[PDB]
Amino acid sequence: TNHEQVLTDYLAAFIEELVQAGVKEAIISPGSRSTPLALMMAEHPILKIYVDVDERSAGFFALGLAKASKRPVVLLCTSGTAAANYFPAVAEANLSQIPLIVLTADRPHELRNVGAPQAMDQLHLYGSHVKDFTDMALPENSEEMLRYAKWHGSRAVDIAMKTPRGPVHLNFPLREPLVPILEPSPFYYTHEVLDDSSIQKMVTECTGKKGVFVVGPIDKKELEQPMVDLAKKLGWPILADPLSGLRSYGALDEVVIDQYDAFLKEAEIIDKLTPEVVIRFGSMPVSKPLKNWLEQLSDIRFYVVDPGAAWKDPIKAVTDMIHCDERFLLDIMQQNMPDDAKDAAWLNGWTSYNKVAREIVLAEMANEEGKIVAELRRLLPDKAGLFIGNSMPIRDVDTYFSQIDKKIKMLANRGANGIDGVVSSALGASVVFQPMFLLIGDLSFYHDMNGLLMAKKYKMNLTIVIVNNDELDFRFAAAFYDADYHEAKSVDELEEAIDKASYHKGLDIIEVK
Amino acid sequence: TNHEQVLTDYLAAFIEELVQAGVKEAIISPGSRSTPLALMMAEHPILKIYVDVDERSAGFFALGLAKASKRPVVLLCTSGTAAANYFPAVAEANLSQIPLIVLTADRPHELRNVGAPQAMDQLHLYGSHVKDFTDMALPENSEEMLRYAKWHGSRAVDIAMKTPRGPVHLNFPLREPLVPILEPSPFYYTHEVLDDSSIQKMVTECTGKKGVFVVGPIDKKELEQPMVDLAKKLGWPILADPLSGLRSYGALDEVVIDQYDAFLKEAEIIDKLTPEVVIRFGSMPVSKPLKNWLEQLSDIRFYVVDPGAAWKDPIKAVTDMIHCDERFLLDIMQQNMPDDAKDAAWLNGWTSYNKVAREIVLAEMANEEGKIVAELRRLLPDKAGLFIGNSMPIRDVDTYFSQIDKKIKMLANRGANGIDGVVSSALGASVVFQPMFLLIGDLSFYHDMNGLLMAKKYKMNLTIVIVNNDELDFRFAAAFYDADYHEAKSVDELEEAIDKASYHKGLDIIEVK
């Protein structure tokens, strides 16, 4: 019934439900108004905490951690411009379907839009870029209002984790004094399914047709193998994006095509490889010549599998929009599509151009923006993570990273793209996948340079490769963040750097000028 | 009539009107979609350009430049998360009434919300935090549409510069190819006034009353002297904020009170200094004991002068809201208020506590977070600029920076406050006021560390004083950005650092641990 108890009961009810609904990590930024929420989250036994004093960096850190783990991740910042720094990562989380619980501390009603210090309008702060907005009540501790606090904690995580996944924003007006009572201590998975009538139409329509699988960047785990099996069963090629995982799932394969970016630039190859059906999985692939090829082809059956109804199709090519779970579709197609449907000449044609274009690529790579990918492909461990920057590193990983027999989790921010926040993204992802590697340009590296503090203060393992095409001497940046600096001037100098980097748990930075 | 000419005619009409309406500077961030707008702004003869690759830093740079010069300043970035990085500075510009023309490049309609790379929803991106939003047409070059492009260029700057001043957002959908034709080359002030009936009511109501002037952070230039004259004429004290300019306008004074933060904490002094009227100018002062004092007093006449109708009053103390120009009000009060109204005992009481509290402060400052302000007060030139960070440096400049007889422009981000972007803010302001000094905490310095690139690549003069109260060794940061590093361990070590800093045109950084 006293002010500080009221504040403690209210927040504890909320925070307890977040953890009980699956939040294990919180990414906190400090400030006056965020203090009571930060202190009480710290007191929670199960809940782990990371402190990032740059809110922009905190947002991308949370993003990367939630993208890699499929876990809902809390953000917490104070009132004022701090909340606005979450915006780039929230917009990214929106488009890449990443479950961020963004909690913004705020002034109380008597201090809202009144000219108070550290205070701005935080109602619908991120606009359409969140799944849900809640302006929470001022702290109360009645039976009704405590259950309300629990209810909103459960709803936040549920909405964020329900497909299509995405960011959820909760605004907390907090009235002074913000001193909580810490002594004594205050402390169902659904998927989309197609109908039996609806699967029969699809099965019959492409039962003996020349089809192509197109897989772009995809979220879901262990979808590599059953996809490979189906394409093998049908005799269909898979045009696999580097971010699909099919180019690095730990096995060599007879259906995965990886040189399509090269050979679809040529006009006669465009004509000869013309399919009857196309089935898309995941986002759109990064390849512009593939994009232009899929745009050009008409009078085909263009399926896209989109369980979240996000309507990602910048080509407007869709004929049949499929709103179901990817693993479900692959399994029913593995059970119901015939075995005797195999045309050997169809797959053969695709694999032939693929073998030919591999030679054209490998004839040049014994001489450096393409050779850096090729050297990285060989030097990487059998189980590793690779975050790729959105500039030139993503176009060169499409050309010079063919299929390898190592398990490599490849991650990029492919929603709203952008050169911002990719260091913190990689660093958040490094909590899940080890060892973590970052192929990055100099512009992106500078942009999110101060996110390297998280690697220093939490003793994280990340190997950074900077393609500096370009006035900046990055040795001083390395020394500042306690990083081991390496300058690779040759192919052999890169080999020594990678070997040294995997040898110690810590931050490594390899600059290639 | 051809695509690239259309694009050139459209943008040139817009850009020409911006310059013709008073835009002299543009702050550009690079990218694919921003390229045609950036190239053509570069071709404009009068328009000066600054390139900031961090969009967050660019926003605060523009903010600082526009705050210092009262000039409208263009921002330009590419599509995607780049636009979202402008948000903290836009929210700040909104509350601090700063005229930013924010231009965001965008995908065309066929690539909007369709799953395209580097693309997000940019309609009403900043929400209520801008004065105006325009989604511009796709480039056309007809007589109607070219005048439309001119019209929007004039409207943008006008709305941004009309009081209450603020940010204006224009979104530009641009269709590929984005290659402009650069060869050959494509290239009233109103103020609020009170009525004669309305001034007579105010003049008579405080014609012989014990009144107090309260001046917080204020925009308007040369408002120092006529304010001083009126308070001298009336025998009224001025409780001047450090950011009012009255504490450093180049003259010592017999009405400016600067120790109110100290002596209004005491209960009997609160009671004895009780006025009959209060007149506020500018924003709310940073002093919490002054805030609490003005809150506590009742049955008074509380005037606030607010020409922009922003209603800045977190105390809700207003009795008479005055919507007119500050210079106008001071001049008519200088002409119409009587001379024989002077009560000597009223001003005497205020100046007495002020003299007493100065002794209490100066008795301690011969021994370091307060002594750093006091040393800075003495060591500064006769004509200088000082940007202050929003953390502990603003509370200590209120206590330990009494009135000096030097002209010092003092600047802070006092709208939405926040520890973010104050380096770029100071660096933008450094274009106008020279020499520029920055008193800053370590948290703020880290937050906007990468804004120091602007000091390096444009060879700017800024002296940074870091109050490191606190793992980071800032020498490596200094070496990275070509800055002269100084470590001040004593009072005399600070003197040597300041002397060296003012001696060369370039970036200086003084750390006090």
JSON list of N, CA, C and O in Angstrom, two decimals, chain A residues 300-331:
[
{"chain": "A", "resi": 300, "resn": "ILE", "atom": "N", "xyz": [4.17, -19.54, -66.10]},
{"chain": "A", "resi": 300, "resn": "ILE", "atom": "CA", "xyz": [4.63, -20.59, -65.20]},
{"chain": "A", "resi": 300, "resn": "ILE", "atom": "C", "xyz": [3.75, -20.67, -63.95]},
{"chain": "A", "resi": 300, "resn": "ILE", "atom": "O", "xyz": [2.89, -19.81, -63.73]},
{"chain": "A", "resi": 301, "resn": "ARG", "atom": "N", "xyz": [3.95, -21.70, -63.14]},
{"chain": "A", "resi": 301, "resn": "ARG", "atom": "CA", "xyz": [3.29, -21.79, -61.85]},
{"chain": "A", "resi": 301, "resn": "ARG", "atom": "C", "xyz": [4.30, -21.40, -60.76]},
{"chain": "A", "resi": 301, "resn": "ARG", "atom": "O", "xyz": [5.20, -22.16, -60.43]},
{"chain": "A", "resi": 302, "resn": "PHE", "atom": "N", "xyz": [4.14, -20.19, -60.23]},
{"chain": "A", "resi": 302, "resn": "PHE", "atom": "CA", "xyz": [5.07, -19.64, -59.24]},
{"chain": "A", "resi": 302, "resn": "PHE", "atom": "C", "xyz": [4.50, -19.75, -57.82]},
{"chain": "A", "resi": 302, "resn": "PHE", "atom": "O", "xyz": [3.69, -18.92, -57.40]},
{"chain": "A", "resi": 303, "resn": "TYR", "atom": "N", "xyz": [4.93, -20.78, -57.10]},
{"chain": "A", "resi": 303, "resn": "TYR", "atom": "CA", "xyz": [4.58, -20.97, -55.70]},
{"chain": "A", "resi": 303, "resn": "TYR", "atom": "C", "xyz": [5.56, -20.21, -54.82]},
{"chain": "A", "resi": 303, "resn": "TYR", "atom": "O", "xyz": [6.77, -20.23, -55.06]},
{"chain": "A", "resi": 304, "resn": "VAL", "atom": "N", "xyz": [5.04, -19.51, -53.81]},
{"chain": "A", "resi": 304, "resn": "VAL", "atom": "CA", "xyz": [5.88, -19.03, -52.71]},
{"chain": "A", "resi": 304, "resn": "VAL", "atom": "C", "xyz": [5.32, -19.45, -51.35]},
{"chain": "A", "resi": 304, "resn": "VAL", "atom": "O", "xyz": [4.13, -19.30, -51.09]},
{"chain": "A", "resi": 305, "resn": "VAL", "atom": "N", "xyz": [6.18, -20.05, -50.53]},
{"chain": "A", "resi": 305, "resn": "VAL", "atom": "CA", "xyz": [5.80, -20.49, -49.20]},
{"chain": "A", "resi": 305, "resn": "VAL", "atom": "C", "xyz": [6.09, -19.37, -48.21]},
{"chain": "A", "resi": 305, "resn": "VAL", "atom": "O", "xyz": [7.24, -18.97, -48.03]},
{"chain": "A", "resi": 306, "resn": "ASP", "atom": "N", "xyz": [5.02, -18.87, -47.60]},
{"chain": "A", "resi": 306, "resn": "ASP", "atom": "CA", "xyz": [5.07, -17.71, -46.73]},
{"chain": "A", "resi": 306, "resn": "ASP", "atom": "C", "xyz": [4.13, -17.94, -45.55]},
{"chain": "A", "resi": 306, "resn": "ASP", "atom": "O", "xyz": [2.95, -17.57, -45.60]},
{"chain": "A", "resi": 307, "resn": "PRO", "atom": "N", "xyz": [4.63, -18.58, -44.47]},
{"chain": "A", "resi": 307, "resn": "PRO", "atom": "CA", "xyz": [3.80, -18.93, -43.32]},
{"chain": "A", "resi": 307, "resn": "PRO", "atom": "C", "xyz": [3.30, -17.73, -42.52]},
{"chain": "A", "resi": 307, "resn": "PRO", "atom": "O", "xyz": [2.27, -17.81, -41.85]},
{"chain": "A", "resi": 308, "resn": "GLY", "atom": "N", "xyz": [4.03, -16.61, -42.60]},
{"chain": "A", "resi": 308, "resn": "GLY", "atom": "CA", "xyz": [3.69, -15.41, -41.85]},
{"chain": "A", "resi": 308, "resn": "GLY", "atom": "C", "xyz": [2.84, -14.38, -42.59]},
{"chain": "A", "resi": 308, "resn": "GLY", "atom": "O", "xyz": [2.55, -13.32, -42.04]},
{"chain": "A", "resi": 309, "resn": "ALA", "atom": "N", "xyz": [2.45, -14.70, -43.83]},
{"chain": "A", "resi": 309, "resn": "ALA", "atom": "CA", "xyz": [1.67, -13.80, -44.71]},
{"chain": "A", "resi": 309, "resn": "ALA", "atom": "C", "xyz": [2.31, -12.42, -44.92]},
{"chain": "A", "resi": 309, "resn": "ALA", "atom": "O", "xyz": [1.61, -11.41, -45.05]},
{"chain": "A", "resi": 310, "resn": "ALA", "atom": "N", "xyz": [3.64, -12.39, -44.98]},
{"chain": "A", "resi": 310, "resn": "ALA", "atom": "CA", "xyz": [4.40, -11.15, -45.09]},
{"chain": "A", "resi": 310, "resn": "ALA", "atom": "C", "xyz": [4.42, -10.58, -46.51]},
{"chain": "A", "resi": 310, "resn": "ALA", "atom": "O", "xyz": [4.78, -9.42, -46.70]},
{"chain": "A", "resi": 311, "resn": "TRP", "atom": "N", "xyz": [4.02, -11.41, -47.47]},
{"chain": "A", "resi": 311, "resn": "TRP", "atom": "CA", "xyz": [3.98, -11.08, -48.90]},
{"chain": "A", "resi": 311, "resn": "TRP", "atom": "C", "xyz": [5.28, -10.49, -49.44]},
{"chain": "A", "resi": 311, "resn": "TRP", "atom": "O", "xyz": [5.30, -9.41, -50.04]},
{"chain": "A", "resi": 312, "resn": "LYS", "atom": "N", "xyz": [6.37, -11.21, -49.20]},
{"chain": "A", "resi": 312, "resn": "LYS", "atom": "CA", "xyz": [7.67, -10.80, -49.73]},
{"chain": "A", "resi": 312, "resn": "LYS", "atom": "C", "xyz": [7.82, -11.33, -51.16]},
{"chain": "A", "resi": 312, "resn": "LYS", "atom": "O", "xyz": [8.06, -12.52, -51.37]},
{"chain": "A", "resi": 313, "resn": "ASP", "atom": "N", "xyz": [7.65, -10.43, -52.12]},
{"chain": "A", "resi": 313, "resn": "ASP", "atom": "CA", "xyz": [7.68, -10.73, -53.55]},
{"chain": "A", "resi": 313, "resn": "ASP", "atom": "C", "xyz": [7.83, -9.42, -54.34]},
{"chain": "A", "resi": 313, "resn": "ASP", "atom": "O", "xyz": [6.85, -8.91, -54.88]},
{"chain": "A", "resi": 314, "resn": "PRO", "atom": "N", "xyz": [9.06, -8.88, -54.41]},
{"chain": "A", "resi": 314, "resn": "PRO", "atom": "CA", "xyz": [9.37, -7.63, -55.13]},
{"chain": "A", "resi": 314, "resn": "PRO", "atom": "C", "xyz": [9.32, -7.78, -56.64]},
{"chain": "A", "resi": 314, "resn": "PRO", "atom": "O", "xyz": [9.59, -6.82, -57.38]},
{"chain": "A", "resi": 315, "resn": "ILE", "atom": "N", "xyz": [8.98, -8.97, -57.09]},
{"chain": "A", "resi": 315, "resn": "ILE", "atom": "CA", "xyz": [8.94, -9.31, -58.49]},
{"chain": "A", "resi": 315, "resn": "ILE", "atom": "C", "xyz": [7.48, -9.41, -58.95]},
{"chain": "A", "resi": 315, "resn": "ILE", "atom": "O", "xyz": [7.18, -9.32, -60.14]},
{"chain": "A", "resi": 316, "resn": "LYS", "atom": "N", "xyz": [6.59, -9.51, -57.96]},
{"chain": "A", "resi": 316, "resn": "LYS", "atom": "CA", "xyz": [5.13, -9.73, -58.12]},
{"chain": "A", "resi": 316, "resn": "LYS", "atom": "C", "xyz": [4.82, -10.97, -58.97]},
{"chain": "A", "resi": 316, "resn": "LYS", "atom": "O", "xyz": [3.83, -10.99, -59.70]},
{"chain": "A", "resi": 317, "resn": "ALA", "atom": "N", "xyz": [5.66, -11.99, -58.84]},
{"chain": "A", "resi": 317, "resn": "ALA", "atom": "CA", "xyz": [5.59, -13.17, -59.69]},
{"chain": "A", "resi": 317, "resn": "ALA", "atom": "C", "xyz": [4.61, -14.23, -59.21]},
{"chain": "A", "resi": 317, "resn": "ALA", "atom": "O", "xyz": [4.24, -15.11, -59.98]},
{"chain": "A", "resi": 318, "resn": "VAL", "atom": "N", "xyz": [4.20, -14.13, -57.94]},
{"chain": "A", "resi": 318, "resn": "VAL", "atom": "CA", "xyz": [3.35, -15.16, -57.30]},
{"chain": "A", "resi": 318, "resn": "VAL", "atom": "C", "xyz": [2.12, -15.55, -58.13]},
{"chain": "A", "resi": 318, "resn": "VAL", "atom": "O", "xyz": [1.44, -14.70, -58.71]},
{"chain": "A", "resi": 319, "resn": "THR", "atom": "N", "xyz": [1.89, -16.85, -58.22]},
{"chain": "A", "resi": 319, "resn": "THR", "atom": "CA", "xyz": [0.68, -17.41, -58.81]},
{"chain": "A", "resi": 319, "resn": "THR", "atom": "C", "xyz": [-0.09, -18.12, -57.70]},
{"chain": "A", "resi": 319, "resn": "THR", "atom": "O", "xyz": [-1.31, -18.01, -57.61]},
{"chain": "A", "resi": 320, "resn": "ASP", "atom": "N", "xyz": [0.65, -18.82, -56.84]},
{"chain": "A", "resi": 320, "resn": "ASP", "atom": "CA", "xyz": [0.05, -19.56, -55.72]},
{"chain": "A", "resi": 320, "resn": "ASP", "atom": "C", "xyz": [0.76, -19.23, -54.40]},
{"chain": "A", "resi": 320, "resn": "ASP", "atom": "O", "xyz": [1.88, -19.69, -54.15]},
{"chain": "A", "resi": 321, "resn": "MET", "atom": "N", "xyz": [0.11, -18.43, -53.58]},
{"chain": "A", "resi": 321, "resn": "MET", "atom": "CA", "xyz": [0.65, -18.05, -52.28]},
{"chain": "A", "resi": 321, "resn": "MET", "atom": "C", "xyz": [0.30, -19.12, -51.25]},
{"chain": "A", "resi": 321, "resn": "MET", "atom": "O", "xyz": [-0.87, -19.38, -50.98]},
{"chain": "A", "resi": 322, "resn": "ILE", "atom": "N", "xyz": [1.33, -19.76, -50.69]},
{"chain": "A", "resi": 322, "resn": "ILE", "atom": "CA", "xyz": [1.15, -20.87, -49.74]},
{"chain": "A", "resi": 322, "resn": "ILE", "atom": "C", "xyz": [1.44, -20.44, -48.30]},
{"chain": "A", "resi": 322, "resn": "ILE", "atom": "O", "xyz": [2.59, -20.16, -47.95]},
{"chain": "A", "resi": 323, "resn": "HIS", "atom": "N", "xyz": [0.40, -20.40, -47.47]},
{"chain": "A", "resi": 323, "resn": "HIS", "atom": "CA", "xyz": [0.54, -19.95, -46.09]},
{"chain": "A", "resi": 323, "resn": "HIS", "atom": "C", "xyz": [0.65, -21.11, -45.10]},
{"chain": "A", "resi": 323, "resn": "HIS", "atom": "O", "xyz": [-0.22, -21.28, -44.25]},
{"chain": "A", "resi": 324, "resn": "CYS", "atom": "N", "xyz": [1.70, -21.90, -45.21]},
{"chain": "A", "resi": 324, "resn": "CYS", "atom": "CA", "xyz": [1.90, -22.98, -44.25]},
{"chain": "A", "resi": 324, "resn": "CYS", "atom": "C", "xyz": [3.35, -23.18, -43.81]},
{"chain": "A", "resi": 324, "resn": "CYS", "atom": "O", "xyz": [4.27, -22.59, -44.39]},
{"chain": "A", "resi": 325, "resn": "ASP", "atom": "N", "xyz": [3.52, -24.00, -42.77]},
{"chain": "A", "resi": 325, "resn": "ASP", "atom": "CA", "xyz": [4.82, -24.33, -42.21]},
{"chain": "A", "resi": 325, "resn": "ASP", "atom": "C", "xyz": [5.69, -25.06, -43.23]},
{"chain": "A", "resi": 325, "resn": "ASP", "atom": "O", "xyz": [5.22, -25.97, -43.92]},
{"chain": "A", "resi": 326, "resn": "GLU", "atom": "N", "xyz": [6.95, -24.64, -43.33]},
{"chain": "A", "resi": 326, "resn": "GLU", "atom": "CA", "xyz": [7.90, -25.17, -44.32]},
{"chain": "A", "resi": 326, "resn": "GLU", "atom": "C", "xyz": [8.20, -26.66, -44.12]},
{"chain": "A", "resi": 326, "resn": "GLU", "atom": "O", "xyz": [8.18, -27.42, -45.09]},
{"chain": "A", "resi": 327, "resn": "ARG", "atom": "N", "xyz": [8.46, -27.06, -42.88]},
{"chain": "A", "resi": 327, "resn": "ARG", "atom": "CA", "xyz": [8.72, -28.46, -42.53]},
{"chain": "A", "resi": 327, "resn": "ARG", "atom": "C", "xyz": [7.52, -29.36, -42.84]},
{"chain": "A", "resi": 327, "resn": "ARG", "atom": "O", "xyz": [7.70, -30.49, -43.30]},
{"chain": "A", "resi": 328, "resn": "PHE", "atom": "N", "xyz": [6.32, -28.84, -42.60]},
{"chain": "A", "resi": 328, "resn": "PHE", "atom": "CA", "xyz": [5.08, -29.55, -42.92]},
{"chain": "A", "resi": 328, "resn": "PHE", "atom": "C", "xyz": [4.95, -29.83, -44.42]},
{"chain": "A", "resi": 328, "resn": "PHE", "atom": "O", "xyz": [4.65, -30.96, -44.80]},
{"chain": "A", "resi": 329, "resn": "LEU", "atom": "N", "xyz": [5.18, -28.81, -45.24]},
{"chain": "A", "resi": 329, "resn": "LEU", "atom": "CA", "xyz": [5.02, -28.91, -46.69]},
{"chain": "A", "resi": 329, "resn": "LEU", "atom": "C", "xyz": [6.03, -29.88, -47.30]},
{"chain": "A", "resi": 329, "resn": "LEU", "atom": "O", "xyz": [5.68, -30.69, -48.16]},
{"chain": "A", "resi": 330, "resn": "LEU", "atom": "N", "xyz": [7.28, -29.80, -46.83]},
{"chain": "A", "resi": 330, "resn": "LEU", "atom": "CA", "xyz": [8.35, -30.68, -47.29]},
{"chain": "A", "resi": 330, "resn": "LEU", "atom": "C", "xyz": [8.07, -32.14, -46.97]},
{"chain": "A", "resi": 330, "resn": "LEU", "atom": "O", "xyz": [8.38, -33.02, -47.77]},
{"chain": "A", "resi": 331, "resn": "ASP", "atom": "N", "xyz": [7.46, -32.39, -45.81]},
{"chain": "A", "resi": 331, "resn": "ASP", "atom": "CA", "xyz": [7.15, -33.75, -45.36]},
{"chain": "A", "resi": 331, "resn": "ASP", "atom": "C", "xyz": [5.98, -34.39, -46.09]},
{"chain": "A", "resi": 331, "resn": "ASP", "atom": "O", "xyz": [6.05, -35.57, -46.43]}
]
